[PDB]
Design a protein around this ligand. Structure first.
Ligand SMILES: COc1cc2c(cc1OC)[C@H](c1cccnc1)N(C(=O)c1ccc(O)cc1O)CC2
Ligand SMILES: CC(C)c1ccc(COc2ccc(CC(=O)NCCN)cc2Cl)cc1
Ligand SMILES: [Mg+2]
Length: 345
């Protein structure tokens, strides 16, 4: 077999970041998506596969890594089939879509699979800060790459099976998605705890204080992030108050500025000492109910970063925690953030 040759070839190429605009202007032909993706997925697969291969043998040799390395290989080979093939042939196109869906399914379990390798490494080699930064360095890049690939595939499979453009809503109502995520977190919270804090949403449209706040975004991504933040904020409010009688609401502010769309989630759950914040974003130190232990925070932070956003926690121990999602607001500033293989190895 030739996998290491292909990995070599395509890891010479750079992933090509797309903007929201570019993603909408595919709402262009299917032939164009096909010829784009049969180049670009190999480039993006190979770039990460190359980085996996740089991991020390004691990590690389583990079953978890070998297993997802084997998925990445099959998936690269699956797309090779189509490199010679003819876009004009409508059956090349429908077989390609078959092929992407198969690939997407194959990769569904990477997160907990890679999680299992983190746990194995913790017990096998220990949990020193240097182990921590390396796992954090590696997985932020790996998971961000994974997000970027799922985005491409979904965009194709959802368009080439009109208002939403695949996973993108050009008129995304932010408050609508906040409530959706709230309602769902409340459901689970009431289940496990038989009480839930209430929601208050305030909006601030600086430039247009009347108009409700719409953006171009990928709502599932925003949902993912708000869901995780609600779960945390509900767990924290409820547990800090099981003696007490009142449950303070969770307050969400949605601010639209010239360049930032900011979503703050303010809970009154007794907060986190500054010392313990960074650990909350750590894959290693969050590996072992509603919320309490999982990869929600770090991965929610990646979804934010993916379109040049961010996601920050600021607490006040004894008072509560502010979680802020920062997004771009303008589709022009909303460009893929990709980890690229190069010098910095
Ligand atoms: C690892 O140690 C701790 C973790 C977390 C907290 C405190 C920790 O030690 C003191 C804190 C919390 C937990 C329970 C009740 N009230 C607040 N949290 C938060 O304030 C919080 C964190 C994230 C978030 O999105 C929302 C929050 O309210 C939970 C984590
Ligand atoms: C399974 C996944 C999540 C995983 C698990 C564990 C790791 C940890 O990888 C480490 C740990 C320590 C060092 C320092 C060092 O001594 N460097 C030289 C070693 N070549 C480097 C790396 Cl790449 C990464 C990814
Ligand atoms: Mg932070």
């Amino acid at each position: 077999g030739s996998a290491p040759k292909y990995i070599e070839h395509f890891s010479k190429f750079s992933p090509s970041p797309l903007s929201m605009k570019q993603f909408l202007d595919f709402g262009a032909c299917e032939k164009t998506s096909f010829t784009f993706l049969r180049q670009e997925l190999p480039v993006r697969l190979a770039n990460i596969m190359k980085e996996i291969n740089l991991l020390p043998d004691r990590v690389l040799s583990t079953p978890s890594v070998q297993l997802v390395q084997s998925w990445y290989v099959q998936s690269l080979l699956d797309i090779m089939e189509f490199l010679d093939k003819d876009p004009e042939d409508h059956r090349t196109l429908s077989q390609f879509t078959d092929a992407l869906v198969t690939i997407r399914n194959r990769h569904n379990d990477v997160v907990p699979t890679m999680a299992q390798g983190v746990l194995e490494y913790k017990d096998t080699y220990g949990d020193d800060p240097v182990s921590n930064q390396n796992i954090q360095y590696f997985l932020d890049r790996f998971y961000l790459s994974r997000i970027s690939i799922r985005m491409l595939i979904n965009q194709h499979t959802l368009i080439f099976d009109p208002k939403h453009i695949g996973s993108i809503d050009p008129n995304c109502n932010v408050s609508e998605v906040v409530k959706d995520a709230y309602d769902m977190a409340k459901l689970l919270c009431d289940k496990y705890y038989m009480a839930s804090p209430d929601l208050e949403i305030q909006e601030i449209n600086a430039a247009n204080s009347k108009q409700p706040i719409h953006m171009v975004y990928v709502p599932s991504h925003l949902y993912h992030m708000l869901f995780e933040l609600f779960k945390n904020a509900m767990r924290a409010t409820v547990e800090s108050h099981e003696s007490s009688l009142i449950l303070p609401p969770i307050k969400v502010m949605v601010a639209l500025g010239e360049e930032d769309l900011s979503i703050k989630m303010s809970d009154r759950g007794g907060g986190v000492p500054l010392r313990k914040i960074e650990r909350l974003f750590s894959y290693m130190y969050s590996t072992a109910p509603l919320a309490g232990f999982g990869y929600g925070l770090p991965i929610s932070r990646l979804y934010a970063k993916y379109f040049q956003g961010d996601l920050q926690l600021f607490s006040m121990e004894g008072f509560g925690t502010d979680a802020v999602i920062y997004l771009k607001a303008l589709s022009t500033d909303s460009v893929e953030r990709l980890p690229v293989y190069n010098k910095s190895a």
